[PDB]
Amino acid sequence: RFLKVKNWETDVVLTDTLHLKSTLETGCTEHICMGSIMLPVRTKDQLFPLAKEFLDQYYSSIKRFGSKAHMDRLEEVNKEIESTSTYQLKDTELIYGAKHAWRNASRCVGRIQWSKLQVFDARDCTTAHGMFNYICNHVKYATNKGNLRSAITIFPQRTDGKHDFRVWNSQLIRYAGYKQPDGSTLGDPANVQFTEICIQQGWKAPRGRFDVLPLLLQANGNDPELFQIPPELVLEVPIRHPKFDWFKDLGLKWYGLPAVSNMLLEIGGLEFSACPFSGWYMGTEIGVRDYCDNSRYNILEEVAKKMDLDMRKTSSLWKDQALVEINIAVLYSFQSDKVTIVDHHSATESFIKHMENEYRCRGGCPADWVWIVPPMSGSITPVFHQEMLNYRLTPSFEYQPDPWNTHVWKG
Amino acid sequence: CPRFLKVKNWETDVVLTDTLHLKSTLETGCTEHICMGSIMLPVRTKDQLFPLAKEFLDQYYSSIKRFGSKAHMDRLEEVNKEIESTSTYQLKDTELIYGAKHAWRNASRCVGRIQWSKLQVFDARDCTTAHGMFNYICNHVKYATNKGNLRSAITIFPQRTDGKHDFRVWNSQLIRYAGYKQPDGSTLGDPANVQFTEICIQQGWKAPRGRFDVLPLLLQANGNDPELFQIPPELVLEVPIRHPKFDWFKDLGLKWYGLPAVSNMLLEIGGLEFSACPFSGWYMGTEIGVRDYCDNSRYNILEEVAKKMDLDMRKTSSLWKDQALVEINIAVLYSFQSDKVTIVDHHSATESFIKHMENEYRCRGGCPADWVWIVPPMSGSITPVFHQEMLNYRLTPSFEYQPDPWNTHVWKG
Ligand code: HEM
Ligand code: HEM
Ligand SMILES: C[C@H](O)[C@H](O)[C@H]1CNc2nc(N)[nH]c(=O)c2N1
Ligand SMILES: C[C@H](O)[C@H](O)[C@H]1CNc2nc(N)[nH]c(=O)c2N1
Ligand SMILES: N=C(NO)NCCC[C@H](N)C(=O)O
Ligand SMILES: N=C(NO)NCCC[C@H](N)C(=O)O
Ligand SMILES: [Zn+2]
């Protein structure tokens, strides 16, 4: 019930007590560990304990636990749930709640930054055009000419579940994917389906390798509409290598702003179905995953060939050599254009420090080791050697179904 | 518990269905509210033993297509009588073999399990003394080594009786290098083995105090105090490590041994406990090139290698550590291959593991696997295992951790 975690490199032991505050399920049981599975409206009665759980932590955090201000608020919210079946967060509660969803994000290595989050309150939004305006402002604010700043933009909460706000895009900025008669895929194969939805809805696709996709925005449960982010708001970086002059001829670019837009933010039982957020990239995200996953841009072979490595045998480690070089190029390119990026060494040692702070001041830090350890050079990063406990704390970011599987089209 | 559990591979969209987990019996360290997936380490009664014996022998008899047979029923009767009368029982040779193979088949942290049915089992249950254990262990090493053409094997010493007469190998592996803490706080040799090296010295080993000294065997028989033995050097196959392009690599002075032989685990078969059960396969290169050489708390050669490569070491973002890592790993695979000693690279091993795992789902209904251990410690996502969802659970027979015997031994003196 009080749990120890060991770092096997430093022999440091931390004691976790925060896990006892954990509320929802992990996926696992006593008999079966599901640590590596990617994916393992509320009635009045459901809502009040959740509202209360949240307000208590809020009031505790501002050192007014058990105060009249505290008691006053619980009653006010109580009355409001009873009368209107939902409630509205104060701005202070909204900001605290968003910062804490990030703080509690077990899969995010960058949480040392958690309290420096710009929160844009878009709860007054009513239309998809409004949503477009809001999202452009977020993109421009967070991009900040390459000196990126963390931000989240929060659209109105779910009500009856028939008036949901949604960003159909999985990130605000991503590249199109197109199935070819050639049998192959042009662009990013992760986005084939979504691209096709855009086309069905009217988009005129350029049909290139790196077409920034349009926004498909859904307000108040209505049908989604298309918008193009002003090109001048989308900062992109051409990818070159500091030693290989041929690298630029591969014709690779990526975007500077990673902005997850398909998750659900839960605060105090309230569900914010449209809550796009952004920080900045860890290099491996692009260089290892986006570029080298076989089901993504899958570029290892092309690169290995230009390096003229021995590709006849796996044991020459040609894949490993090429992987490192692709990742060097990513970091060098972002750095040279002054676009914020963090390498996996820097990011993981910051995370270990954050864990130690969180253990010290909070009693723990939920972490998913499977996601936190980078997808290259794992054991030469400190997090590989760190035992971590994964559990679910609220406020939280949650996965939610892709809206086209569920949207009841009006036509 | 749900009858069916699905696992998906996110590279291929292949979905597999696990039913085998229903035969899982012991616990994980996980609860409904906590996942302890990344945590390293989270005598029996007559009553406790009957059912464990029974479960096992039903599995054994089922596997040989003789389930429910008179032979099956006689054998159950015989074991039941043996347990009631003697408090324990003895396995038949065929059952010991099947047992050991299955402990390997069920080892969720082993990526080499495509090999599980090809295992040489050495029955050392007639062993009574530490000199006897030395001789069994020498034979295992020579057989397994096979002049570089490595053969998987296990040597099984007598099972636990009352817990006061345990056979133990005090070494963590049959072959490993000494570590020596210096008065200045540096370590000469392998820091992982500093504690065991001090024990050996105390027991009377005359340490050469070099960087790669093969440790002596420290063997406990029948609950007696451990005794020291030197493995004949002619039996210890080692590989000097060089790089195919960097002729300075050899002057690092690195080598390693060819035979990885875990010697400190406990093998459970039908409720019986084999506390001494050294087993060996062959190396996947990363064990040596990533962990043994490059962990900060092991040989820690990254800086020295990067220095000789003249990488830019002022900023992590040059990925100099990463670049040196790959070159060290090329060198390990190249050196072993050049000397004709079996080694597998992490690409080939993981590809084979995924093939093995698919086959096990079809023919067996499952394959328990611990992702944290199965994914290699470099280049994780360019191996297929990274993209494969895994279910980790405990099947018996099993290999299990046990405390270090120096923490528990009652010294006779
Ligand atoms: C500030 C710099 C940040 C860095 C360096 C960072 C780093 C990362 C990385 C490397 C991942 C793994 C993503 C993947 O593998 O696809 C991740 C996931 C995640 N992060 Fe962050 N992050 C940052 C900002 C944020 C912010 C601002 C939030 C929320 C406001 C956040 C919440 C999350 C969540 C909820 C996940 C899991 C997403 C999923 O399951 O797909 N992160 N983070
Ligand atoms: C034949 C070639 C083999 C290969 C390539 C192989 C591969 C591996 C690797 C890479 C690990 C992780 C070790 C570490 O990170 O320290 C491992 C662990 C393990 N393997 Fe194997 N193995 C082989 C043979 C065997 C055999 C013959 C057995 C038993 C008969 C076995 C049972 C185990 C067990 C119980 C573990 C967990 C060890 C621990 O928890 O410290 N392996 N294997
Ligand atoms: C199956 C397994 O969960 C999957 O491949 C995971 C592995 N760890 C991850 N880690 C991060 N950061 N991002 C991911 O997408 C993955 N995917
Ligand atoms: C804390 C974490 O479990 C620990 O460092 C693990 C990680 N995965 C591993 N994987 C393998 N194969 N071998 C190990 O020793 C480790 N150690
Ligand atoms: N660093 C972040 N967010 O701030 N990553 C968000 C997910 C991005 C996704 N991994 C990609 O490579 O596009
Ligand atoms: N492949 C095996 N056995 O066959 N590994 C056993 C553990 C070896 C340990 N990882 C080492 O590097 O010494
Ligand atoms: Zn688990």
PDB file of N, CA, C and O in Angstrom, chain A residues 112 230 241 245 272 275 327 376 398:
ATOM      1  N   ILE A 112       8.097  18.280 -16.585  1.00  0.00           N
ATOM      2  CA  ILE A 112       8.797  19.225 -15.712  1.00  0.00           C
ATOM      3  C   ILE A 112       8.281  20.650 -15.962  1.00  0.00           C
ATOM      4  O   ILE A 112       8.276  21.495 -15.057  1.00  0.00           O
ATOM      5  N   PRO A 230      -3.687  29.480 -41.982  1.00  0.00           N
ATOM      6  CA  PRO A 230      -2.858  30.347 -42.811  1.00  0.00           C
ATOM      7  C   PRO A 230      -1.472  29.779 -42.904  1.00  0.00           C
ATOM      8  O   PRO A 230      -0.811  29.642 -41.876  1.00  0.00           O
ATOM      9  N   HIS A 241      21.669  17.655 -42.917  1.00  0.00           N
ATOM     10  CA  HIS A 241      22.623  16.975 -42.047  1.00  0.00           C
ATOM     11  C   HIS A 241      23.881  17.818 -41.995  1.00  0.00           C
ATOM     12  O   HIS A 241      24.279  18.367 -43.021  1.00  0.00           O
ATOM     13  N   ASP A 245      25.990  16.332 -47.280  1.00  0.00           N
ATOM     14  CA  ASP A 245      25.356  17.331 -48.142  1.00  0.00           C
ATOM     15  C   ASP A 245      24.236  16.718 -48.980  1.00  0.00           C
ATOM     16  O   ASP A 245      23.321  17.404 -49.397  1.00  0.00           O
ATOM     17  N   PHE A 272     -14.268  17.969 -21.580  1.00  0.00           N
ATOM     18  CA  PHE A 272     -13.935  18.918 -22.642  1.00  0.00           C
ATOM     19  C   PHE A 272     -13.400  18.119 -23.832  1.00  0.00           C
ATOM     20  O   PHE A 272     -12.223  17.732 -23.880  1.00  0.00           O
ATOM     21  N   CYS A 275      -9.890  20.187 -26.952  1.00  0.00           N
ATOM     22  CA  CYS A 275      -8.925  20.782 -26.046  1.00  0.00           C
ATOM     23  C   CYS A 275      -7.489  20.677 -26.642  1.00  0.00           C
ATOM     24  O   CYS A 275      -6.570  20.156 -26.040  1.00  0.00           O
ATOM     25  N   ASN A 327      18.395  11.163 -37.035  1.00  0.00           N
ATOM     26  CA  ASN A 327      18.094  11.883 -35.798  1.00  0.00           C
ATOM     27  C   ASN A 327      19.039  13.038 -35.499  1.00  0.00           C
ATOM     28  O   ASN A 327      18.635  14.052 -34.909  1.00  0.00           O
ATOM     29  N   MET A 376      14.712   5.076 -29.362  1.00  0.00           N
ATOM     30  CA  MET A 376      16.087   4.680 -29.673  1.00  0.00           C
ATOM     31  C   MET A 376      16.965   4.826 -28.426  1.00  0.00           C
ATOM     32  O   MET A 376      16.596   5.555 -27.506  1.00  0.00           O
ATOM     33  N   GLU A 398      -7.658  12.032 -21.790  1.00  0.00           N
ATOM     34  CA  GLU A 398      -8.128  10.694 -22.063  1.00  0.00           C
ATOM     35  C   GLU A 398      -8.220  10.531 -23.569  1.00  0.00           C
ATOM     36  O   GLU A 398      -8.458  11.507 -24.314  1.00  0.00           O
TER      37      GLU A 398
END
